[PDB]
Amino acid sequence: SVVLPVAKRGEDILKLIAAPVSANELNSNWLYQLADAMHATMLERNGVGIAAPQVYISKRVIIVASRPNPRYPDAPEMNAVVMVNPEILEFSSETCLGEEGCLSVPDERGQVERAEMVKVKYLTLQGEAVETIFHGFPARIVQHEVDHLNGILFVERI
């Protein structure tokens, strides 16, 4: 497993709209190795999520994990979910502020208003369609990672 270099705020890769993964990439050693290298990168930095743009890959691939911490002690321990072409279908009206950091903004942490719950549809690495509702810290991480795919850093939301 490879740890990849991470783009920092100021780098233009972080401001693009990432390109969808095409059907012929699904269920490929190419997509498995990309997910594996993203996963190894997130763990090396003690992250709970990562988006492909952060490792200079302008593609719609994110990982969402969760672990309990100071700010959310009842946050689940959740192993990496790889989400290909994730789409948030619905944001809850209920909104709560929560502590965020970013691998691309290692200097700063902040309070961000996020939907308490999001309905998300995505493809597995195999190309299987999944629809899940995320709540709480994992909802926040999914919103943060989709923002990365859309060229948005959390500091722009404070």
Ligand X SMILES: O=C(O)C[C@@H](Cc1ccccc1)[C@H](O)SCc1ccccc1
- Residues at the binding site are 102, 144, 148
Residues 6 or more apart whose CB falls under 8 angstroms from that of 25 comprise 31
Candidate ranges 8-16, 98-106, 109-117, 130-138; the one touching Zn ion (CB under 5 A): 98-106
Q: Which is nearer to a second copy, 18 or 65 (CB)?
A: 18
Amino acid at 93: S
Binding-site residue ranges for Zn(2+): 102, 144, 148
Residue of 35, 64, 102, 120 interacting with Zn ion (CB under 5 A): 102
Catalytic residues: 145
- Nearest Cα to Cα of residue 18 among 2, 32, 7: 7
Query: What is the contact mask toward ligand X in residues 22 to 41, using x (rule: CB under 6 A)?
Result: --------------------
Min CB(51)–Zn ion separation in Å: 7
Amino acid at 14: L
CA torsion 55→96→90→35, rounded to 10°?
20
